[PDB]
Amino acid sequence: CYXKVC
Amino acid sequence: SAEDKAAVERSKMIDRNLREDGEKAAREVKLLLLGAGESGKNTIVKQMKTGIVETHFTFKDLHFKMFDVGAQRSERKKWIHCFEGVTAIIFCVALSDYDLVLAEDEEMNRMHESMKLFDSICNNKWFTDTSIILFLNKKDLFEEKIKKSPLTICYPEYAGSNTYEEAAAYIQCQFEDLNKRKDTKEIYTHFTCSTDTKNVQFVFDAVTDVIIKNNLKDCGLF
Amino acid sequence: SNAVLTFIYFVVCIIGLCGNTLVIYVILRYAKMKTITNIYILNLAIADELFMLGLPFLAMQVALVHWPFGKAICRVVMTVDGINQFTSIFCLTVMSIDRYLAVVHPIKSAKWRRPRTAKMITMAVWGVSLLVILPIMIYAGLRSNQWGRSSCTINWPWYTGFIIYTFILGFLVPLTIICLCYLFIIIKVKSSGIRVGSSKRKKSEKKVTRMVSIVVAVFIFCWLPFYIFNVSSVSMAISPTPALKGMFDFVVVLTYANSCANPILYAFLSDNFKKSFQNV
Amino acid sequence: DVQLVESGGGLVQPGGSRKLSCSASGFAFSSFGMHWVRQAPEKGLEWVAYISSGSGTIYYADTVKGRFTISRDDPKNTLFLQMTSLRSEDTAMYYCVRSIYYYGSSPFDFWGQGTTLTVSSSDIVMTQATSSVPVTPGESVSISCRSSKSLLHSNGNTYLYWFLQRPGQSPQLLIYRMSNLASGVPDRFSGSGSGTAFTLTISRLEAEDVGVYYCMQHLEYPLTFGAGTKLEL
Amino acid sequence: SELDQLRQEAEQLKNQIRDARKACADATLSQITNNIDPVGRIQMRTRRTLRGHLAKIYAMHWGTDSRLLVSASQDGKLIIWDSYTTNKVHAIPLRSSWVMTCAYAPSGNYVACGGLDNICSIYNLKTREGNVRVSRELAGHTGYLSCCRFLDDNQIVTSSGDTTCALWDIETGQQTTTFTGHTGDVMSLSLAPDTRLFVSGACDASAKLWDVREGMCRQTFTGHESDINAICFFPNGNAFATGSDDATCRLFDLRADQELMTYSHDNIICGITSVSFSKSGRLLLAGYDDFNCNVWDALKADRAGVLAGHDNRVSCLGVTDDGMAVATGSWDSFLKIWNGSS
Amino acid sequence: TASIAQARKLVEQLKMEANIDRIKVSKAAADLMAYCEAHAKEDPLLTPVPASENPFRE
């Protein structure tokens, strides 16, 4: 996860 | 066409001058000036300076237009809607007309005729949200009258006390009780000074507070 | 554990895409157009509408981990959820400067408050955001890191300080401005009716300070734990818990609830728009 | 009343420059479009340039477009024309024409007295094929000219303009837009026609109705003149 | 002594006219017009939308060419419009903002306006210069001005709130006649087709047909409960419809001398601000303050249209001289031009 | 004699308005519907014209 999804 | 392109080109020179004049006239403060007649309206115009007499007295970076409809001996309900979008309403009431009778029919003595007019200006459907500035005009003249005669010929249910500062607990609170729209207006009240500051500074201070609370109703916060 | 996780993304996209349609329905038709606070709440409603249109494209990626064609779809749908997400927090930091210029400077504003210089600001925020998301514009990054099933978040060549950039420009530049441009509104609604000529209706400051502490409590509840989860991701690595697939995916969609509240909060309190919506 | 008077020029060596100014006084010059029109010796008139009111629309004559420069200044109430790289066809008396365009106005009505410039060395054509007519006072005169394109427009009017230049005088609008009489003209003149061929009629000739009777179009730019139709006594 | 017998002598002449009136009221006109065709749902559409006023529009008036029109508004502007292309021919700045009326001269050379300043200002459109300037100001009224109407380039008639109408000579600048019969504020005029009479409704709910050359009230028309806000003449010249704050309008007659048809509706409890007739005299158009101009089939007393495009009250409206258009300026600062499609 | 002159000014006004030679309304109002059917063709709002002659084309 980084920005908007993991 | 060629000439029809220069008529279109002219109409948007008309248009950008109706827009330039109309954004220089939304920055102006419009103020009705009502009252009972010989009630000190002529005094405060001389401070703040045949049909309408539009007095323009732009004084502290804010351009005021004051419209004295004094000599409009006609039905007030037929031309009062012209002043619907108006910032405040300056209303003068003579304090010395407490026991002084009116010259019409020897009715209730010339301040129940002012209070009858205030109830017709507060609760008027065009003035649902135009907050009225109140002036109490003849402050010096009734103090010499309240020592001679008590405040019972006008208000027989008063307390008494024959005092200069007592009548604020009689006269001012009686007029602010006529405000039936106690949630949408404010009835900013004053005692008309004889100095150059404290009778037009109040008109500037209490019309900014109309402007601030007009923006908070415009910017959602109210 | 993505049972209610995939459902809540399309359950907030219904109220969001319909909420900001209700604002443009009452401004593009029953216009003000010269009340310049009604071209900002229009422009915020455009931004919170376009930022909701990229929410169903990200909604399936938590159920179907394999993403659609990242050459074009995942290469630009995070460019549509980058411009419309950085104007739907920049339309409401210029609408909150707009409220500062009215309520505390109601004389010196009107030389720079006419409805032509507001159209030169309300498009100047639409252009600044595309000059801000320029990292996301080129580095779309179709990635297949965990268990295959190629998805689309980012692939940068630095990398650690991009969440600093989305936070020091998308959470501490608006919230510093908004809290200053709303604390100064408190110190003149409780001062013009206090120091200068004053009535007994100075109780109305308690009306202003109630509906103005909402707008930061709504704003900080929908943006702060999103960046708080990301700074733990740039920190020492936590364990990949299956609750972290349930508590990061729920805080991502919490950021799309701020853009659901601005048709409720910034528009449907304003009495000129409330009386417009009551009629229409 | 209304008065346009222009300055500048008279004698210049070829290949040079000259600044023609036109001082306006008596009317609302910031609300008028302004032309320049020239007239070479023993020739007809020829349109030079244009500014719309408010300086929004500038045209030029396609003969010398890019060589001349037309400019106005409303607080000074003058009208400038900068003419550079002066040729030999530029030798003409230059007029200052007043013109206002709204619904129902009379364009091209007030012409200045003029200034002269001498040196030392597609679009519509208006044709007045008659050059001169011998005529005796009292009879009905009928002057006619032809256009190339149809002058009638789809909005409804017919942009043909008439002008009289008396000997030793300035042009004077008689009929604007093919039918309508100008202000202060005698009622004897009348204009008519249909589409491409028109006829100016006078009913009674007088001693000041002698002169050369030009016809202009205004349908699209250039405002092309024709060679004139002389009436002598 | 005798003043209370002249109190009885006054009503002695009033009940005599009452029995002379219901005798000649032999049949109501709606039971003769039972057989005529109702015009159907008149549907008009805002072809043009003339925008550029920035406050309430208080009066408009068409030119005689049916193409130019003047509108007055509370922002102190008098705008001449080309109604064909929505492009403004002139915008005239007024000396007082509080303007309640405006008129176009039948030659189109002149435009008048007036209002709370008790002056009908006359403006010259077709100057030898470029501008529009003030020809004459007509001072001599005591109350506000309600309606100016030109007879020609040199004679205008004005009503006022001092209960007096007045005929003027614009050249000398002073009123040749003064018409004093009303007791309330006169609120509207309409000149006759032949311009040899006019009729004026007042705040005392009375209407009074005058004579411009004699100078006295021919007939006096009652029938309303509240103030009359709007007169226009029928195209015949022998009728006029009064529009009241009573939320009603009624049609009159000079040769019959009583009300004939009253156009009301029980859902309409809002007062009429303007009245105008159509070219056939078949569409009374009236601008109410439930924000929408209604369009009254004037022969049948059943509303046959509505021009509901206005966001505030419809203060002014006028049908052209060829029956072709209709403007309805209103308090939402727009004039909308209405023409029904086939 | 000022308030008597109010009643003076209305008596000869009411009797010069009393001798008006008026006709009953069954001919005086049926001539107003007789105005309309003689002018019902050229009223462009009572009957919409063909749109090629309409100068107001949106």
Author numbering:
A (entry chain F): 2 to 7
B (entry chain B): 6 to 54, 182 to 354
C (entry chain A): 42 to 198, 204 to 326
D (entry chain E): 1 to 121, 136 to 247
E (entry chain C): 2 to 343
F (entry chain D): 6 to 63
From the paper:
Among the five SSTRs, SSTR2 is aberrantly expressed in many cancer cells and tumor blood vessels, and it suppresses cancer growth and promoted cell apoptosis. Accordingly, SSTR2 is an important drug target for the treatment of multiple diseases, such as neuroendocrine tumors (NETs), thyrotropinoma, and cancer. To understand the role of the two cyclic octapeptide SST analogue drugs developed from SST14 and their subtype selectivity, we herein determined the cryo-EM structures of SSTR2 in complex with inhibitory G proteins, with binding of endogenous SST14 and the two cyclic octapeptide SST analogue drugs (octreotide or lanreotide) at resolutions of 2.85 Å, 2.97 Å, and 2.87 Å, respectively. The structures of the SSTR2–Gi complex bound with SST14, octreotide or lanreotide showed a similar overall conformation, with a root mean square deviation value of 0.55 Å for the main chain Cα atoms of the three complex structures.
Another SST analogue drug, lanreotide (with a half-life of 1 h), was also developed, containing the core β-turn residues (D-Trp4, Lys5) which are also present in octreotide. Moreover, two residue differences were observed in lanreotide (Tyr3, Val6) versus octreotide (Phe3, Thr6) or SST14 (Phe7, Thr10). The EC50 of SSTR2-Q126A was attenuated upon SST14 (from 10−8 to 10−7 M) or octreotide (from 10−7.7 to 10−7 M) binding, while the function of the same mutant was abolished upon lanreotide binding. These observations indicate that the interactions between β-turn Lys5 of lanreotide and Q1263.36 are essential, which is consistent with the observed closer distance between the side-chain carbonyl C(O) of Q126 and the N-H of β-loop Lys5 in lanreotide (3.1 Å) versus the N-H of β-loop Lys9 in SST14 (4.0 Å) or Lys5 in octreotide (3.5 Å). For the residue change from Thr10 in SST14 to Val6 in lanreotide, the hydrophobic side chain showed interaction with the hydrophobic residues (LAMQ102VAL) surrounding Q1022.63 in SSTR2. Replacing the β-turn Thr to Val in lanreotide strongly changed the interactions between SST analogues and SSTR2. A series of conformational changes in the SSTR2 receptor were observed upon the binding of lanreotide, including structural rearrangements of highly conserved motifs that facilitate receptor activation and signal transmission from the receptor to G proteins. Hydrophobic interactions between D-Trp4 of lanreotide and F2726.51 on TM6 could affect the “toggle switch” motif, which was located in the middle of the TMD and formed by F2726.51, P2716.50, and W2696.48. The interaction between D-Trp4 of lanreotide and F2726.51 rotated the angle of P2716.50, resulting in deflection of the side chain of W2696.48 and the consequent expansion of the intracellular end of TM6. In addition, the cytoplasmic end of TM7 moved inward by ~5 Å when measured at residue L3157.56 in the SSTR2–Gi complex/lanreotide.
